[PDB]
Amino acid sequence: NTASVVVLCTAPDEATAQDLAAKVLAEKLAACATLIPGATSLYYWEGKLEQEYEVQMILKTTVSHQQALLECLKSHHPYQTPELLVLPVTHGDTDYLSWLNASLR
Amino acid sequence: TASVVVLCTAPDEATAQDLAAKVLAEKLAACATLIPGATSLYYWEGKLEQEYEVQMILKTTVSHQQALLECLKSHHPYQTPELLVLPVTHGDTDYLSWLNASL
């Protein structure tokens, strides 16, 4: 029984976000994906301010599967450079955690 | 006073608002934020489920953490809320003072 972690990744739209989630679930690299639509990203690129629609993905997994999950997401990105960050979890519901660990075989 | 962010999931905005109001009244959280319209994907019994959900983001202090996790768990139909606690390393000092001024 398994420490958890929350992985944030950005997708350009709902269909991409959905398909991504499906794949990493199928591979048992995450137990649950949460997808938040409607977001805007702003950032400079090559000297210009960009403003883009996004879906914020929130992926729940254990510290044992974190590197492979990260590897998988980076493999699917068109330029192998996903906006991908890991936040530490300092506590779960231990029953939800039991399910999370069980889901990952 | 240190603060934490608690994440939890509710099936619809109506139960999510009810639960927010209750934990705020019991002074287990200072602020509860709700984002409906989320999609959650996961496996059940070998088939992929896809449901709409409301993401909850609850702000509280470490000294109120356990008691929050407990009213939340009691409250969940099967007693297994999707509940995850994130550490906060810093922030606004005046905001944080107000967080603690609840209790």
Place this chain on the structure above:
Amino acid sequence: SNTASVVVLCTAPDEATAQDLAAKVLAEKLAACATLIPGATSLYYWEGKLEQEYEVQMILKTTVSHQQALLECLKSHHPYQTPELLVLPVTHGDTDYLSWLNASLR
């Protein structure tokens, strides 16, 4: 040589406010990317009545070296100098993304 990253959460009332705020902190190189999430409602007691209010949740990505200046700027822009502002530590991951967030800021 890359610095650690952080996530800064800040709350804004609406898209116009949040987008003006993001543009200014970006132009000043205090954050590398700002994500705005509309659709949030917050509930809290204030003077001491239960309020419910619509919000835009801001997620700002920056380095530990620029954290304090970012906090200071956002605070200064807030109409009461008291922004709902929290910092979360990042423990990993994508090295190219991290290299870009660093290059963005100097």
